[PDB]
């Protein structure tokens, strides 16, 4: 008997006398099991179209915003990544930067505004922790802030 | 079957086509397969026949009833003539689990035969427990199952399964172990019995055959002149008994014109036809007493109304071609010729072997038309008298109601428009003496006849 | 096949014939059957009857390009070409049964002949005996020469006969030997064949029976590389790579058939006299050595498998006998500096442990074995 | 017209024959016509969606109308014939005989005449 859901749906579409024909249920068989491996390359391809669900279309996506692919990377981190880059593109006001900088760690944040005249702080929170390095974030941040403000830091889990 | 739209599909030829047909015929064939010593009748159905002989071109069973079912015969009275020395193909299979290898069942054949029946028994591939038992006519596959490893289901098996008309099984002892693989075991030590007919054992199928009731009798393609002779002396006999059968004949092979045109003078019964030219069908050859058959079966079919003055044969091709004169002589001889005209090959004058005499009513004897009437008249007034005779008060109502029920036939014989003319009334010579068991009668009736020729005078 | 072409007079109306048969007679009446019409047009009718079929399939089988049968096979023996004879289907076939039984060659097994389907025969090319093992193999053949035969594994069934303690009989794999040749091939066979010159066997000669066969790119020749008028065929690939063993062989039996038997002789394209082998340049194997320095996070074995691929790459751009330009590889190691892609820095970039562009001589070139030195 | 052939199935079975090459058993064009005549009088009509409307047959669905039997008679007729009438090769079908059998279980027979049944004039100038 066909094991495939469409084989069955499209041998069922046929005439009836193939109740007991091995030979056309083996060929719908094989042409079901087809086109479900359609169907679900479908799903993958709606997935791909995507950053957030980029999966091995991440590549893409990175090649689309000039990131460095990188496959050994962690796919979250690649993600987050790319998120970043494509939110950057409008004024950084508060609202703006620290959901950039958190979508870009991953971990909570809240821009102090910092009170010395030409600062802004930043201060990471997460339940898990940190690793001990941390310096692309610094280094994004840097690339990212008004060139006429510094920044301060402080991290808490 | 369960409620529903089914359907299937058949060949035209598989119609039942037997509806509308007339007459009986009668034949002692030379048969591989089917009943022996006794008469069946068939219904004019090729698969039928096929079915209970076999389709053995090489014995006269196959060859002839094809013959005379291609003349249209209503119903095929069948004797499977034999030499004795009769036996049924056997086979004996055996245990495997015993050493001795138990004989444990025994197969045979449904009917006698001499065909290559065989048996091929294989290890079931799907399980082990069970076997594939496929039985084999030759090399031809004819039947397939698996069954249980029980002696009695194998038996009850072989002997239920839809295909099994030719071979039954039976137990010769009991075991727990399925049968032994084989391939291709012949059911060896059975025979036809068409080896070496010998010249008494036609008789004993002319007396089975004086039981039933036939309109012709024809012979099973032989031209023995004994067989001749002891055929007509025994349709002289039953004629005397009021059975008033129709003899067909045909010279041998190698008889000449002058030969056949010599017997049939010899005999010239108007109860006796002879055929005078051999023929080709299928591109096989047919002596004169092989188309005896067909001709018969034509004569038969065509019962009253028709006849086979110009027939239009099955027959492709004839031996010997004869000229005019020639035809005339045969004809003149009482001689059954065909004649091949424009690629059809054509019976001429329907006439029988009775041409000695014709001393003027007497004529209308020498054709096959006119003697099929008149047997067929005598067989319906014989079985009218049946009912009657010491059953019905001999008075003068009695004898009124019967000549009423003669009149009243004969007027059904005057729908068909077979007669112009027709008269029965009392036998008076007979009836002043005349009592109780018997009665007698007198008629006379004047039959149309079938247009034979045309004279044509262009006045110019 | 191509359309016949026929005369006018090959073709002629049985009418016209009568007409022309009845132009002359002016006294007697010349009506539809009258003497004189019965006569005559018999004639006209049997002249054109022939006129129409005899000779016209004579000028049908004249020419090759309408032959047919015994016909075409004789021209092209005109030409000495021979049509493709069939061959039997062969195979072994699995016996069983008792051990004392013994099985002869020359047995005959069939198929399972039914209404729909005859028996395929079949013969044992082999005389064995079961006494050993309960179940031997025998070879066999189809007696019937052709694509009939061939059957699927199972098939074999049948028994002709009856030999005594044979338990079962059953083939135990599909046969392959059959084989039938098209007329309309044969034909396109006998058509083509009709080269005019440039069948010397010279370098040009040689080089365009290489290019023939498929699978070959490019040819070169040797002449007399083993003296005895020998020549060597040096080929590459459609990619201009080493050709394959089974290349080699083919265009081996193309020019040069070795399997000749005794009585036999080369069908080859090479003439008498000509000695042949088919040759491959070797494949160089660019070993590449340097003390690798790899980006943060960037798996090592990644980053050079890519730069093994770009290498390659360049490789394949280099035919026979080509340069391999070490200076051009150091820019294709530092290609990914330049991009940034994993590669932070390198030093002692050698090619097996060479620092100069190496010329190729009767050799391709293919990549190696990135190897990092991880120099202590 | 150039109709051609198909492959047999053994309607009994309900499998493909296949010679003992393992290629299925290759059948002329009547014979291909036959087996197509079987499957679209079993086919039903509008519900095996891989069909246009034009194939199948409605018996079926006339076991369960209400129609009366001389009815149901006249509408298996016109059924069977629409049916098979649609494919060229067809040139008629008719003699229709009905036999009730038993009370309400019924058996009918039919012809099909072919294309190549018909009967040519001979006749030329």
Redesign the interface.
């Given at each position: 008997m066909i094991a495939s859901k469409k084989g069955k749906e499209m041998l069922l579409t046929l005439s009836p006398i193939y109740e007991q024909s091995i030979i056309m249920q083996s060929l719908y068989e094989a042409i079901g099991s087809e086109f479900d491996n359609l169907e679900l390359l479908d799903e993958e391809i709606e997935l791909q179209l995507f950053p957030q669900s980029a999966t091995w279309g991440l590549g893409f996506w990175e090649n689309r915003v000039g990131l460095?692919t990188?496959?050994?990377?962690d796919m979250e981190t690649r993600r987050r990544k790319v998120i970043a880059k494509l939110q950057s593109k409008y004024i950084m006001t508060p609202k703006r930067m620290s959901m950039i900088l958190q979508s870009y760690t991953g971990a909570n944040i809240k821009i102090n505004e910092n009170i010395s005249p030409y600062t802004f702080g930043v201060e990471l929170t997460s339940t898990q922790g940190f690793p001990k390095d941390l310096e692309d974030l610094y280094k994004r941040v840097n690339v990212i802030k008004p060139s006429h403000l510094a920044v301060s830091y402080k991290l808490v889990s | 079957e369960i409620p529903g739209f089914y359907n299937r599909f058949k060949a035209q030829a598989e119609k039942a086509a037997a509806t509308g047909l007339k007459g009986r015929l009668a034949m002692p064939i030379r048969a591989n397969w089917g009943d022996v010593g006794k008469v069946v009748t068939i219904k004019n159905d090729l698969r039928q026949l096929k079915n209970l002989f076999g389709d053995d071109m090489n014995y006269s069973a196959f060859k002839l009833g094809k013959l005379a079912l291609l003349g249209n015969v209503k119903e095929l009275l069948l004797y499977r003539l034999v030499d004795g020395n009769q036996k049924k193909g056997t086979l004996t299979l055996k245990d495997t689990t015993e050493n001795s290898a138990k004989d444990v069942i025994k197969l045979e054949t449904k009917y006698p035969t001499a065909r290559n029946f065989?048996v091929?028994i294989?290890?079931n591939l799907v399980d082990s427990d069970k076997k594939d038992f496929i039985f084999?006519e030759?090399?031809?596959?004819l039947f397939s199952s698996s069954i249980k490893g029980t002696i009695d289901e194998i038996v009850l098996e072989i002997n239920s399964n839809l295909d099994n008309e030719y071979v039954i099984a039976t137990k010769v002892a009991d075991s727990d172990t399925i049968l032994?693989?084989?391939?291709?075991?012949?059911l060896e030590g059975g025979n036809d019995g068409c080896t070496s007919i010998t010249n008494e054992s036609y008789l004993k199928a002319l007396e089975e055959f004086e039981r039933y009731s036939f309109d012709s009798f024809v012979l099973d393609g032989v031209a023995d002149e004994a067989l001749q002779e002891t055929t007509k002396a025994w349709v002289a006999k039953n004629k005397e008994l009021g059975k008033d059968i129709l003899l067909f004949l045909g010279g041998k092979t190698e008889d000449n014109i002058k030969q056949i045109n010599d017997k049939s003078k010899s005999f010239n019964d108007e109860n006796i036809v002879n055929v005078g030219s051999s023929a080709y069908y299928e591109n096989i050859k047919y002596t004169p007493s092989e188309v005896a058959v067909y001709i018969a079966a034509l004569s038969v079919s065509k019962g009253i109304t028709g006849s086979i003055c110009n027939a239009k044969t099955i027959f492709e091709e004839v031996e010997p071609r004869l000229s005019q004169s020639e035809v005339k002589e045969c004809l003149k001889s009482g001689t059954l010729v065909l004649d091949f005209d424009d690629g059809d090959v054509i019976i001429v004058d329907d006439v029988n072997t009775f041409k000695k005499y014709v001393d003027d009513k007497n004529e209308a004897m020498g054709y096959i038309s006119n003697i099929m009437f008149i047997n067929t008249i005598n067989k319906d007034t014989s079985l009218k008298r049946k009912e009657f005779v010491g059953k019905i008060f001999n008075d003068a109502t009695g004898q009124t109601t019967v000549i009423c029920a003669l009149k009243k036939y004969f007027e059904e014989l005057m729908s068909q428009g077979i007669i112009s003319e027709f008269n029965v009334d009392i036998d008076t010579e007979l009836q002043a003496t005349a009592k109780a068991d018997e009665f007698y009668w007198k008629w006379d009736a004047v039959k149309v006849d079938v247009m034979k020729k045309i004279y044509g005078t262009g006045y110019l | 096949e191509r359309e016949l072409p026929i005369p006018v007079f090959l073709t002629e109306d049985e009418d016209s014939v009568h007409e022309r048969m009845l132009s002359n007679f002016q006294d007697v009446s010349t009506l539809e059957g009258d003497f004189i019409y019965d006569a005559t047009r018999p004639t006209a009718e049997q002249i054109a009857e022939l006129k129409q079929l005899g000779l016209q399939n004579n000028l049908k089988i004249a020419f090759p390009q309408t032959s047919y049968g015994t016909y075409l096979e004789w021209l092209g023996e005109c030409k000495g070409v021979f049509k493709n004879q069939p061959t039997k289907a062969t195979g072994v076939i699995t016996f069983?049964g008792v051990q004392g039984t013994i099985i002869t060659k020359g047995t005959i097994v069939?198929?399972?002949?039914?209404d729909?389907?005859q028996?395929?025969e079949f013969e044992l090319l082999e005389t064995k005996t079961i006494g050993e093992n309960e179940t031997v193999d025998i070879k066999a053949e189809s007696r019937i020469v052709g694509?009939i035969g061939?059957?699927?594994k199972g098939?074999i069934?049948?028994?002709?006969?009856?030999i005594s303690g044979?338990?079962?009989?059953?083939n135990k794999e599909?046969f392959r030997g059959g084989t039938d040749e098209d007329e309309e091939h044969f034909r396109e066979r006998v058509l083509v064949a009709e080269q005019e010159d440039k069948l010397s066997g010279a370098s040009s000669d040689y080089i365009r029976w290489a290019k023939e066969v498929d699978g070959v790119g490019y040819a070169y020749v040797v002449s007399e590389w083993a003296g005895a008028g020998t020549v060597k065929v040096l080929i590459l690939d459609k990619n201009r790579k080493a050709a394959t063993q089974e290349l080699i062989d083919k265009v081996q039996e193309y020019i040069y058939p070795l399997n000749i038997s005794e009585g036999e002789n080369r069908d080859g394209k090479a003439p008498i006299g000509a000695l042949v082998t088919v040759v491959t340049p070797d494949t160089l194997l660019i070993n590449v050595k340097a003390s690798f320095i790899f980006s943060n996070?960037?798996?090592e074995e990644?980053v050079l498998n890519n730069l093994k691929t770009k290498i390659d790459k360049y490789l394949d751009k280099i035919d026979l006998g080509g340069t391999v330009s070490y200076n051009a590889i150091q820019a294709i190691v530092g290609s990914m500096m330049l991009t940034?892609?994993?590669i932070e820095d390198f030093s002692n970039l050698t090619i097996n442990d060479v620092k100069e562009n190496i010329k190729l001589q009767d050799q391709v070139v293919g990549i190696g074995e990135i190897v990092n030195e991880v120099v202590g | 017209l150039d109709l051609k052939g198909s492959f047999?199935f053994d309607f009994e079975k309900g499998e493909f024959?296949k010679?003992?090459?393992?290629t299925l058993?290759k059948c002329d064009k009547v014979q291909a016509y036959k087996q197509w005549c079987q499957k679209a009088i079993l086919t039903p009509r509008y519900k095996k969606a891989a069909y246009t409307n034009i194939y199948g047959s409605e018996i079926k669905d006339l076991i369960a109308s209400n129609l009366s039997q001389s009815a149901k008679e006249l509408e298996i007729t016109r059924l069977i014939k629409e049916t098979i009438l649609v494919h060229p090769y067809t040139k008629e079908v008719g003699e229709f005989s009905f036999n009730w059998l038993e009370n309400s279980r019924l058996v009918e027979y039919e012809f099909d005449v072919l294309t190549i049944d018909d009967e040519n004039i001979v006749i030329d100038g």
């Open positions: 460095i990188n496959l050994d990377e | 065989n091929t294989k290890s084999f030759n090399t031809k596959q032994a693989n084989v391939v291709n075991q012949a | 069983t069939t198929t399972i002949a039914t729909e389907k028996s395929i694509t061939n059957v699927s098939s069934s049948v028994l002709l006969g009856s044979v338990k079962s009989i059953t599909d996070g960037f798996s990644t940034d892609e994993g | 047999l024959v010679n003992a090459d393992g058993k």
